[PDB]
């Protein structure tokens, strides 16, 4: 009771149709018979049934055309790296490595990738040579480089009949070829600069690219350690895919610096590392969670605060542009070919989206700092209730105590009138009364209570603060317009070779204007937040020591009254003696 | 060092130019010489200088074309009534009574009117007859009727050459003439129905119109009481301009009922009057200020609440339309002359603006009730702090007390061990300890404290309530469009005799839709407000009696400890005896 849901793809046996039973969601891809395949390859097709039973869409998204995220490429190395390790354990050579053969499985966010066109065709496959797994290595590092470039690793849009002949002329220690608009073929052993990656892993991934893209198949992934059945490629993948790196945005300078983490460094020696890095003293270096929880020093993207610095100035976030982009800043109206234009405009929307994530992370650190302020406020309310409570407890004990000793001095004075009492305990108890009247801490709790309601009024005022995310969605609109202009460029055929880019530069203008606005308002927010936070931190030991003094006069006075009791018991037993 | 500011008006001596010195704001109206007046009337003009040194714009506002407000017409009776009383003391007959001769002086809201065209020309002036102050009476009641009609009291837009001849045929006990579209001349001794006035004063003002507009000058204001140098007209003005009337919107039925106030009625007998009027029992009848302050019963537009009724239904505000307006409801597209159209459309915008003031006053009563809820919340916080404070005072006195008597039972037991103590006060003090342990009211303060934080959470939720005034400004836009359509009708010459009125009926549709919406949301608000208010009112005597019990165990326990003291003094003096 179901139908064909959607034609999934094609194949040598025929087209693939993904099915679904709407009453039961019976999802299955079934490669149908469309090609009328020869019976030899039909038997080999059922062999493929016994063995199989034994992404490019996301790439063509205009956001993704710049290159992918860090953890996306890392998780791609995990899924596809582990997958081809499993396949090379199973003696399998797919010969068909492409993002069109990558199924995306969203398990709650965990995008599990599985395995199921001449630029992925190896040059040994391009001329039908003896093959091995290094072919699939070549396509692997090919595709993973395309995950950050947005394009092929070698002479993009060159026809493979001579493009593979240029592949035969590659410097093997170099990894990337770029061609100028004059046709200048040059090489690079470096990554092209608009990435989204941190250099600390890029350089072992650079040498990894030096291994994975040598066109000699005996050298491509060649140093295979038979200790671990892996090349040095998979050694570096094992290192990097477990290489712990803490990324820290300096909130005070708007700078993210990554850090290699040795597997047993304490957080304090890390504070020494950031201390040497930034100059910020560890007593003033303050760090806390993404959710706004201060980091436990007892433990081994968190956000950097300087306690000893109060007012934070404007951003020290240098946000560069390329000389092509700067050339558009000089004149956006030059009529240049689209080979430049898709690249440069991708760098532009790339740049703007980078600014959006900058404000996004700064927005996060602001919210998290406000959460820490709320926790400090909560402890302030707890010590408030403790203070008011135990303070009025002290006041009542004062009242009851002195009225008690007033009655005791009346009757004791009547016994001194009877020639019974002694004047020494009389004067002593009058000193007890005088020291009780000295215990006049009931004004201090009202004054520091006025400090409490002062700061509580301040943080209630900080609740009603306006937010720059109002202009953050304006940045979303500007970036969205930039995406739309990139799409309108992207669907142009070769007849639309020359174009203008002025409105995008206007989006850059209003972008940096709005970003300066939300940074000024934002730094005003954080400035008042850390100010009132400092007021709370300075307020706490006063409340603590004062409450301690309350407990001092508490146990003091109770001991004094019990002393008065026992003295009356002494005069009792003395009168029992006589 | 100044110039002519603006030409104010005209005159027989010439045009009047209002001056101003921009550096000093030297405002003065100066009647210039434009007419080249004859020297006899120039000498009479300087006579007018010696005697003078001895509004129609507001009428033509489309809001005001329906008729003026209540207090506006009343203040007009005060200023112009008192002014012509002063002028008739000075033997002055102006002969020139018109709103064009009325200067508006805004003293902080108090619009002081002062004294400075054939429909205001009296029929005795129209035929140049012997004159008196009853001429200015005729123009006075003429203009004051025009303040509520928006038009002349007799056959509007009729040419005075025969319109005064129709004035000679007026029924003197009748006050108003209306003409049908067939030309049917009829009379009315009543006010035309679209007023803005309360009938309680209208009927003495109706007979006042029967006196002030009789075309016999010896009868117009004729019964002049020489006891007070006034006609019965000024007697009724003296009554009505001091006639105290409390206007009360029934919030429960969306109805305003006016009330004559005898000059010494207490507020309780007023509650009997509203009690007989509405059926609402005085124990449930609740009244409070415009600013949300409950009315003192000890004293002699406030808003009516029913305490015994919880959920208030939809409005019982009948808002009628005329049969002309209902005829437009039948078909707005009938092509009828503008003599109807300006009147009927004025009734329409009149109706919509009336609905706007309805929601405005209901909005006021909602805000005021919320203010009363805040005051109840404030008393709740005061009793909260008193309760928590004195409660923990009681707890500390319990602790100190029982530890005290624990020490006293230890030593007293040691003296019973010494063969000294008696068991009766032993067992008695153990009963004192047991009753102290019985005093376990520290859980009740936490439970009713949870009720306090419950209601505090509820009223904090009521703070974030959405407001129907969002659609109130939508009503402002709809009414503003209706004003614009009335203006576009109003500037039409006689060539635009036939018109359509459908979009105004659409404004009536969206008006009553939005009004039903804001009344539903509004009554939901007030329903939850009175509900939580009832919760607070029920919560209060629990807190009060519990706190009273705290004071009971307070003075009880203190008396018990002092009793224990005095008993030890008894054993002391007994041991002194032995």
From Swiss-Prot, chains A, B:
ATP binds at residues 8-16, 31. Belongs to the protein kinase superfamily. Ser/Thr protein kinase family. I-kappa-B kinase subfamily. Keywords: Acetylation, ATP-binding, Cytoplasm, Kinase, Nucleotide-binding, Nucleus, Phosphoprotein, Serine/threonine-protein kinase, Transferase, Ubl conjugation. Disulfide bonds: none annotated. This is Inhibitor of nuclear factor kappa-B kinase subunit alpha. It is linked to Cocoon syndrome: A lethal syndrome characterized by multiple fetal malformations including defective face and seemingly absent limbs, which are bound to the trunk and encased under the skin. Bartsocas-Papas syndrome 2: An autosomal recessive, severe form of popliteal pterygium syndrome. Popliteal pterygia syndromes have considerable variability in severity and in the associated phenotypic features but they are all characterized by cutaneous webbing across one or more major joints, cleft lip and/or palate, syndactyly, and genital malformations. It comes from the Eukaryota. Phosphorylated by MAP3K14/NIK, AKT and to a lesser extent by MEKK1, and dephosphorylated by PP2A. Autophosphorylated. Component of the I-kappa-B-kinase (IKK) core complex consisting of CHUK, IKBKB and IKBKG; probably four alpha/CHUK-beta/IKBKB dimers are associated with four gamma/IKBKG subunits. The IKK core complex seems to associate with regulatory or adapter proteins to form a IKK-signalosome holo-complex. The IKK complex associates with TERF2IP/RAP1, leading to promote IKK-mediated phosphorylation of RELA/p65. Part of a complex composed of NCOA2, NCOA3, CHUK/IKKA, IKBKB, IKBKG and CREBBP. Part of a 70-90 kDa complex at least consisting of CHUK/IKKA, IKBKB, NFKBIA, RELA, ELP1 and MAP3K14. Its EC number is 2.7.11.10. Widely expressed. InterPro entries: IKBKB_SDD (IPR041185), IKBKB_SDD_sf (IPR046375), IKK (IPR051180), IKKbetaNEMObind (IPR022007), Kinase-like_dom_sf (IPR011009), Prot_kinase_dom (IPR000719), Protein_kinase_ATP_BS (IPR017441), Ser/Thr_kinase_AS (IPR008271). Residues 2-235 form the Protein kinase domain. It comes from Homo sapiens (Human). GO terms for molecular function: ATP binding; IkappaB kinase activity; protein heterodimerization activity; protein homodimerization activity; protein kinase activity; protein serine/threonine kinase activity; protein-containing complex binding; scaffold protein binding. The gene is CHUK.
């Amino acid at each position: 009771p179901w139908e064909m849901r959607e034609r999934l793809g094609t194949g040598g046996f025929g087209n693939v149709c993904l099915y679904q039973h709407r009453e039961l969601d019976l999802k299955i891809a079934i490669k149908s018979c469309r090609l009328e395949l020869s019976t030899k390859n039909r038997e080999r097709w059922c062999h493929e049934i016994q063995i199989m039973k034994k992404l490019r869409k996301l790439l063509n998204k205009p956001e993704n055309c710049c290159g992918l995220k860090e953890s996306q490429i890392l998780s791609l190395l995990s899924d596809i790296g582990s997958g081809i390790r499993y396949l090379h354990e199973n003696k399998i050579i797919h010969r068909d490595l492409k993002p069109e053969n990558i199924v995306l499985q969203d398990v709650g966010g965990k995008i599990i990738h599985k395995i199921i066109t001449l630029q992925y065709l190896a040059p040994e496959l391009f001329e039908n040579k003896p093959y091995t797994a290094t072919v699939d290595y070549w396509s692997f590092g090919t595709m993973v480089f395309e995950c950050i470039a947005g394009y092929r690793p070698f002479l993009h849009h060159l026809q493979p009949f001579t493009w593979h002949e240029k592949i035969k002329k590659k410097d093997p220690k170099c990894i990337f070829a770029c061609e100028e608009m004059s046709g200048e073929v040059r090489f690079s052993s470096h990554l092209p600069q608009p990435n989204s990656l941190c250099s600390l892993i890029v350089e072992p991934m650079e040498n990894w690219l030096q291994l994975m893209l040598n066109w000699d198949p005996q050298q491509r992934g060649g140093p295979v350690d038979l200790t671990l059945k892996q090349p040095r490629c998979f050694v570096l993948m094992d290192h990097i895919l477990n290489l712990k790196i803490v990324h820290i945005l300096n909130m005070t300078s708007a700078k993210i610096i990554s850090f290699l983490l040795p597997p047993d460094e304490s957080l304090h020696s890390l504070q020494s590392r950031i201390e040497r890095e930034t100059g910020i003293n560890t007593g003033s270096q303050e760090l806390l969670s993404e959710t706004g929880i201060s980091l436990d020093p007892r433990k081994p993207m968190v956000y950097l605060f300087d306690k000893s610095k109060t007012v934070y100035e404007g951003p020290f976030a240098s946000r560069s542009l390329s000389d092509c982009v700067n050339y558009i800043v000089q004149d956006s109206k030059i009529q240049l070919p689209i080979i430049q234009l898709r690249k440069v405009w991708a760098e532009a929307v790339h740049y703007v989206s980078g600014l959006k994530e900058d404000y996004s992370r700064l927005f996060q650190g602001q919210r998290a700092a406000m959460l820490s302020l709320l926790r400090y406020n909560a402890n302030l309310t707890k010590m408030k209730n403790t203070l008011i409570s135990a303070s009025q407890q002290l006041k009542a004990k004062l009242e009851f105590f002195h009225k008690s000793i007033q009655l005791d001095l009346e009757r004791y004075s009547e016994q001194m009138t009877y020639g019974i009492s002694s004047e020494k305990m009389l004067k002593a108890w009058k000193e007890m009364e005088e020291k009780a009247i000295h215990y006049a801490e009931v004004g201090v709790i009202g004054y520091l209570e006025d400090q409490i309601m002062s700061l509580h009024a301040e943080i209630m005022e900080l609740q009603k603060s306006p937010y720059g995310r109002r202009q953050g969605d304006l940045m979303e609109s500007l970036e969205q317009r930039a995406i739309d202009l990139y799409k309108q460029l992207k669907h142009r055929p070769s007849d639309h070779s020359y174009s203008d880019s002025t409105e995008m530069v206007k989006i850059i203008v209003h972008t940096v204007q709005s970003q300066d606005r939300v940074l000024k308002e934002l730094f005003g927010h954080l400035s008042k937040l850390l100010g009132c936070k400092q007021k709370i931190i300075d307020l706490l030991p006063k409340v603590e020591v004062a409450l301690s003094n309350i407990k001092e006069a508490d146990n003091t006075v109770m001991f004094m009254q019990g002393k008065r009791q026992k003295e009356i018991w002494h005069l009792l037993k003395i009168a029992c003696t006589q």
